[PDB]
Amino acid sequence: DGVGSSSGNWHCDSTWLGDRVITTSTRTWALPTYNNHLYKQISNGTSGGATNDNTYFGYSTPWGYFDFNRFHCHFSPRDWQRLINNNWGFRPKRLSFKLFNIQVKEVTQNEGTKTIANNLTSTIQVFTDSEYQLPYVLGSAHQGCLPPFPADVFMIPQYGYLTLNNGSQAVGRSSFYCLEYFPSQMLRTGNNFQFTYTFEDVPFHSSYAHSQSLDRLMNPLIDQYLYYLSRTQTTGGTANTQTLGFSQGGPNTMANQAKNWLPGPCYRQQRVSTTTGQNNNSNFAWTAGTKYHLNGRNSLANPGIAMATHKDDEERFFPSNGILIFGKQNAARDNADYSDVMLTSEEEIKTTNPVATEEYGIVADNLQQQNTAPQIGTVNSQGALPGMVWQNRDVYLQGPIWAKIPHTDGNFHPSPLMGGFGLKHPPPQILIKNTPVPADPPTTFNQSKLNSFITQYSTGQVSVEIEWELQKENSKRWNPEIQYTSNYYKSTSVDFAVNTEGVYSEPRPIGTRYLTRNL
Amino acid sequence: DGVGSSSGNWHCDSTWLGDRVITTSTRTWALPTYNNHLYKQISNGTSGGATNDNTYFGYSTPWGYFDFNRFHCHFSPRDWQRLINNNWGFRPKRLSFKLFNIQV
Amino acid sequence: DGVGSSSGNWHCDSTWLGDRVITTSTRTWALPTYNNHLYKQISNGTSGGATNDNTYFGYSTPWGYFDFNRFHCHFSPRDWQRLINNNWGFRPKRLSFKLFNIQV
Amino acid sequence: DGVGSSSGNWHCDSTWLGDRVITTSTRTWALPTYNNHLYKQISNGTSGGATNDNTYFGYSTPWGYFDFNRFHCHFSPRDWQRLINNNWGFRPKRLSFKLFNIQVKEVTQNEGTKTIANNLTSTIQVFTDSEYQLPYVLGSAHQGCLPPFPADVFMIPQYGYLTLNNGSQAVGRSSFYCLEYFPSQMLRTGNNFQFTYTFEDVPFHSSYAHSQSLDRLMNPLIDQYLYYLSRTQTTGGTANTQTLGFSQGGPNTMANQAKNWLPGPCYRQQRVSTTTGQNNNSNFAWTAGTKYHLNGRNSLANPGIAMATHKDDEERFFPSNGILIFGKQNAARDNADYSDVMLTSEEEIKTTNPVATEEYGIVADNLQQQNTAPQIGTVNSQGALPGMVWQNRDVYLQGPIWAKIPHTDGNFHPSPLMGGFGLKHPPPQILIKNTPVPADPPTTFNQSKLNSFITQYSTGQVSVEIEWELQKENSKRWNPEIQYTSNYYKSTSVDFAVNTEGVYSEPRPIGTRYLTRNL
């Protein structure tokens, strides 16, 4: 474990083995000293501009954390292509994490001339929250994951957390955590860190689309033996009176046929169009937004339960807060243009799932009588009903992978809404920090905590290995399937590649669901 | 025992085991050079303001010392809560001390 | 099994053992003859005051029953305090029931 | 274990074996139902007459308890005589307790005619507080111990306890105990109970008196080699000036001699006389009483630390609250006459202990100078000083035996002030109760607790066995010793015997300290 010997090698590869694929990626990182070595209380209240919906109480910390919860941390674009085009499903089995080649540096600033040198005897600290005792902040779709492009160098994100609040104030149950109250490894240059984790059994993600729909599973050529009420009134001439008539469902009355199953749950959302002209002229984004209400605070149900983005022939429409949206490269943080963002679509599930912007269905409102005409009600939110079947949201190359399932007495179908695999025991948080190095202390004792420190940062490499288990296709379909393909014709630059300026970009979102399977 | 390898790890924890609790804490420290490398005689006498009650004779030294004789050196507030709320008594049995990761 | 020998002893205690707590309680009881030795049909209908919401048909019996389905049947207040203050969870594992010292 | 067979036999005996004596006594008892089956809160406050000094908060219980903490529970008068006359010391080693021959009875009252019958199927409950979890009420010198005379039949005392109070009010730390929250044995007629206990090591009580005194341990015939300041001023004529003169202690100046030891501690008490005429005419009993002050309440220090009752030749005097006093038979509870009570005396300890009604000694008050004459102070309370030696209070045939030493961080010489042996783990409290038997319940359910019960009492016999270890005398004294003796001359009735009316009485208090031993 020398100053002069490397502690790691660079592993970035993929290997495919029948029913497994293993991915490895290595990236270079930089870690600053965060927060001036301090833990600070932060809050947001209702004074000034701030709304109640946005209040919080929390702490910010001197630590940083490692995040690889984005598919493109692990899969190259071509690899993602091999996966989606060929497999019905996949899931994660196990991972390996390595930190190595660690360099701690001190920066000296005199007279506007700045210099950087190694501090050989310096350490950094790392630990994993193996027991899940710290608030789990992965899974909230934050920035700071390993870059898609291997050549890119990245900065480690600062760690902070939230607890209960009333306005800008803490409450009795509010909790404070010190990360220094955990055991951590200390590494000098020449030391390394590693750990291994095994994923819990989780269902394969469905990289497939149904080629059948719930409302059409019958034999087109045959009648049912079952009957339905087809006529309530006589049909001939003007003297029409009530009657009862019954008919057998058949090829031309598939809508009426008796069926075994129901479409999935519905929490309806407002429809907006990409053709702006077709939209109402108000700013209705949050006012007409679909929301949930918790303890007096309102949150967008974004993106909410999975529903199809649009019905047949209407690519223009999307749910206002019902899809995942990714930025194009260098898209602005605020108020980016439609041309600067990429909207996902979940067409593939119209097959079993309600369209996002429409009713679930219709129910009776009242009791009909000779003097009372029957009335119906439109159902815009439907909870789980026996016989319902549904599909989860898709995952994307630039999307999230896993989430920690919250620790609660109950849940229904705990698949993370943003997409991915939901785990009771997800990959643990990995926290890293530069150890403080004091500048020279005073020569006579003072009890106050030291506030003068040498200025330091560290850089190193990090490796992640994941084994994924694959589910192969078993289709008897005669004709060819849809596949993700690169564009045939000439172009100014190559998709999923660099610029003349050296900027990698991902042009489109890529989903998982090209192959088909029956219902 | 290299320049480039750490000699210690950071242990700060509590474990409770029935009739024992074990506490560990780690802190970072800084030590200056004290006294210019010298031992100096010091005294306080009765001249000027000074009263008899406050007289002394002593020495000051170039050395520093480690002190962990305060309960909160070892117990977090929540830990202190588990202790006081649940036990009739406690006492100390043994200790371990480590100095590491030294930079001059 | 004599007229003159007791068939049971009075056990009312709590013992705490790490991850288990065991509670015991004993009480004295009295049982009357119920219903005059008869099973009787009972109902409530809609005549008079009575609403539909409250209708019933049933029987009443000569028997009595034992009920210990209330937490304080088993936990003393102090015991409940030790439990709630210190544990994330609890559940019931097994029970023993005894009837003794019977006098008619 | 039949209805018709006895479960115990009557054992009342003494056997002497060299260095042990074993005593057995059996008595008959009766237990009523106490408190109507209820636990009741009781308090005393400051309203009306009541003073602050007498406030309390507590509970009374349905239970009864067994008390044998009086020497005459175990020793017959003749036995006590063999013990005191012949042994330097004694202490308790172990005990056996038995309850047997139990009869539970129900009493029926109709029309002013009352009848008593057995209730064969009835039970009583017994338990020992082996773990000391209930407030220990023995050791406070209460009534209700087993009678001195074996033929007497006795009633079991009711159990009650006290906790913290403020005035008549409870405080946060006030505690409530239910005895039904302990396991107890249930016995029908024909069942029995027993247990065995071992006394912890405790020092032998001193049944001896010193034949030497602290101030006279020297050789009467020889001088000390040590000197003392004997003269501070010249003696001849009128022109007397200061000087220093030094002399050697000797036979005629024993008061001046250097010595190794000091007399025991002193908390001074007011002196009162049996000859009333010599007493001041006020009612000064509690106003001039020696007291301690705890949390704003004052209590007599009765009888307090052991000091001698009177000095030579003054039998008339006693400390106002410094001795134990016993009633003569049928003496009144309140305001009994001097002729109706028996006062103890602790003459025997004037040998090492200060007289109760006098100063410990004299100390300097100031600093003498040519212009300031020296001044002295009288010491009326003296705490422990190095070199002090002392003797404990005596024990009496009608006196207490043991006390529980309070559970505290500290104590000094934890010998109970009333006399006896102080134990961290004393003989446990034994609690007995009649089990409730309900009268007929109502024929339709009511949730209220039952308040109608059959009327019952129980009677039985109880046995205690104790082994005492003796310390034999080893005296080289030539002349005869003092001994307790029965009176030589004729008398109307025999001392320590019955009346023409069948009333046993104990005529005098008998102490333990007849034989002598050097210091």
GROMACS .gro file of C-alpha atoms in nm, chain C residues 2-14 24 26-36 70 74-76 79 82 100-104, chain D residues 1-3 119-123 125 179-191 433 435-439 441-447 450:
model
   72
  625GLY     CA    1  -5.957  -3.281   4.766
  626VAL     CA    2  -6.227  -3.067   4.914
  627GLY     CA    3  -5.962  -2.933   5.151
  628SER     CA    4  -5.666  -2.872   4.919
  629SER     CA    5  -5.622  -2.579   4.686
  630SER     CA    6  -5.589  -2.651   4.318
  631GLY     CA    7  -5.401  -2.344   4.217
  632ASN     CA    8  -5.183  -2.066   4.336
  633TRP     CA    9  -5.198  -1.702   4.263
  634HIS     CA   10  -4.972  -1.594   3.986
  635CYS     CA   11  -4.955  -1.227   3.894
  636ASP     CA   12  -4.618  -1.105   3.771
  637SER     CA   13  -4.414  -0.972   3.485
  647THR     CA   14  -4.922  -1.335   3.434
  649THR     CA   15  -5.490  -1.388   3.829
  650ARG     CA   16  -5.832  -1.260   3.922
  651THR     CA   17  -6.127  -1.372   4.128
  652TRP     CA   18  -6.458  -1.427   3.956
  653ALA     CA   19  -6.823  -1.490   4.021
  654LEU     CA   20  -7.067  -1.667   3.797
  655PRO     CA   21  -7.440  -1.650   3.834
  656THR     CA   22  -7.691  -1.876   3.676
  657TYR     CA   23  -7.793  -1.702   3.362
  658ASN     CA   24  -8.126  -1.714   3.192
  659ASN     CA   25  -8.295  -1.947   3.426
  693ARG     CA   26  -5.785  -0.592   2.679
  697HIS     CA   27  -5.208  -0.822   3.129
  698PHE     CA   28  -4.992  -0.519   3.163
  699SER     CA   29  -4.963  -0.301   3.467
  702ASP     CA   30  -4.510  -0.239   3.256
  705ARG     CA   31  -4.141  -0.008   3.000
  723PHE     CA   32  -5.896  -2.324   3.979
  724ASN     CA   33  -6.005  -2.299   4.336
  725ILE     CA   34  -6.360  -2.348   4.243
  726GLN     CA   35  -6.640  -2.309   4.486
  727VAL     CA   36  -7.001  -2.378   4.406
  728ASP     CA   37  -5.381  -3.309   5.266
  729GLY     CA   38  -5.727  -3.386   5.404
  730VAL     CA   39  -6.008  -3.197   5.564
  846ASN     CA   40  -6.632  -2.290   5.466
  847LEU     CA   41  -6.440  -2.592   5.352
  848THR     CA   42  -6.367  -2.481   5.000
  849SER     CA   43  -6.231  -2.142   5.097
  850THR     CA   44  -5.871  -2.033   5.060
  852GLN     CA   45  -5.329  -1.646   5.031
  906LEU     CA   46  -5.014  -0.696   4.659
  907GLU     CA   47  -5.220  -0.897   4.419
  908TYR     CA   48  -4.954  -0.835   4.164
  909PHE     CA   49  -4.732  -1.083   4.337
  910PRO     CA   50  -4.755  -1.456   4.322
  911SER     CA   51  -4.904  -1.612   4.631
  912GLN     CA   52  -4.981  -1.956   4.760
  913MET     CA   53  -5.344  -2.041   4.802
  914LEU     CA   54  -5.433  -2.273   5.088
  915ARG     CA   55  -5.749  -2.451   5.179
  916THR     CA   56  -5.790  -2.620   5.511
  917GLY     CA   57  -5.548  -2.905   5.493
  918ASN     CA   58  -5.276  -2.717   5.307
 1160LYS     CA   59  -5.513  -1.254   5.323
 1162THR     CA   60  -5.956  -1.477   4.949
 1163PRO     CA   61  -6.281  -1.308   4.862
 1164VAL     CA   62  -6.592  -1.516   4.828
 1165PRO     CA   63  -6.873  -1.348   4.649
 1166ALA     CA   64  -7.231  -1.359   4.760
 1168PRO     CA   65  -7.434  -1.222   4.180
 1169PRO     CA   66  -7.711  -1.067   3.987
 1170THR     CA   67  -7.876  -1.277   3.729
 1171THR     CA   68  -7.820  -1.040   3.444
 1172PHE     CA   69  -7.478  -0.901   3.369
 1173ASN     CA   70  -7.349  -0.586   3.522
 1174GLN     CA   71  -6.996  -0.464   3.464
 1177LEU     CA   72  -6.869  -0.696   4.291
   0.00000   0.00000   0.00000
